[PDB]
């Protein structure tokens, strides 16, 4: 376990600086975000400055996806057994109501739940929505 690096972040920065919303941002986001936890995905997104309207389209996508997820995964009743974890919720996958450790556990369980890969798909749909508007 290590947080995405300042170094990888620089790159993502330089990419968005010039390729803000050409189709080439998408293949780059996907490489720079390999093995990313939700937290790291959000760290990437946060370094983006300005582009407020575009970010908001992306957020709207994330919010829609997360609600769909929840829909498709009703929580079972009963108290969570010891050494077990609650099934992630939309907001958990998006890193707004989950922790690192939690994120980390899921991506490892056998079989895992790769909350990082899931969130990253949502983000990509969001980036396709940006690209379609602007280019």
């Amino acid at each position: 376990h290590q947080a995405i690096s300042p170094r990888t972040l620089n790159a993502w920065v330089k990419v968005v600086e010039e390729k803000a919303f050409s189709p080439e941002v998408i293949p780059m986001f996907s490489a720079l975000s390999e093995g990313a936890t939700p937290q790291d995905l959000n760290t990437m997104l946060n370094t983006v400055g300005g582009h407020q309207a575009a970010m908001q389209m992306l957020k709207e996508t994330i919010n829609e996806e997360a609600a769909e997820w929840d829909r498709l995964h009703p929580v079972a009743a009963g108290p969570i057994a010891p050494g077990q974890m609650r099934e992630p919720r939309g907001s958990d996958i998006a890193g707004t109501t989950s922790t690192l450790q939690e994120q980390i556990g899921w991506m490892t369980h056998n079989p895992p739940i790769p909350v990082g890969e899931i969130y990253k798909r949502w983000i990509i749909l969001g980036l396709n929505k940006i690209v379609r508007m602007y280019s």
Binding site: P74, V75, A77, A81
Partner: protein, 164 residues
């Protein structure tokens, strides 16, 4: 008395096992107590008679009360809607404690669990509303049919239930 007492007669694959009785703390959580009591008598036309303990985790708890779907995804209260967490005054202090299963805050229906250990970490998330009076020996036996993920090895049913 203010606090009612309810019994379950437990059977294992139809074979009688023994009776468990529960004091329900109507004096602290009357709405929750009144739900379980009324589901125990069948006085609403539906309730726990016949239903099964679908999830038993040895050293943790026995859960049941899903008399509509029998697997954890159902259950219904007497209120015509899932009901709020009344309070969290009572704590999960040991074996015998009877608590609401729930699927998130303020989603109480009919599912409940009987603790077989101290589970203090549940405090604040499941409403405690009663405790086993007689027959913890029988809950201990029931536990023997559980598994790490809760699946049971025999069908553990409430063959009969009511108020004493």
């Amino acid at each position: 008395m203010v606090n009612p007492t309810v019994f379950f007669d437990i059977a294992v694959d139809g074979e009688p096992l023994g009776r468990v009785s529960f004091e329900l703390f109507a004096d602290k959580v009357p709405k929750t107590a009144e739900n379980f009591r009324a589901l125990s008598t069948g006085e609403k036309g539906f309730g726990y008679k016949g239903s099964c303990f679908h999830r038993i985790i040895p050293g943790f708890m026995c859960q049941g009360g899903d008399f509509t779907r029998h697997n954890g995804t159902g259950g219904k209260s007497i209120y015509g809607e899932k009901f709020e967490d009344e309070n969290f005054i009572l704590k999960h202090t040991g074996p015998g404690i009877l608590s609401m299963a729930n699927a998130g805050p303020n989603t109480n229906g009919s599912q409940f669990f009987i603790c077989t250990a101290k589970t203090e970490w549940l405090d604040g998330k499941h409403v405690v509303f009663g405790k086993v009076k007689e027959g913890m020996n029988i809950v201990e036996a029931m536990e023997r049919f559980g598994s790490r993920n809760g699946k049971t090895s025999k069908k553990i049913t409430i063959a009969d239930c009511g108020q004493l």
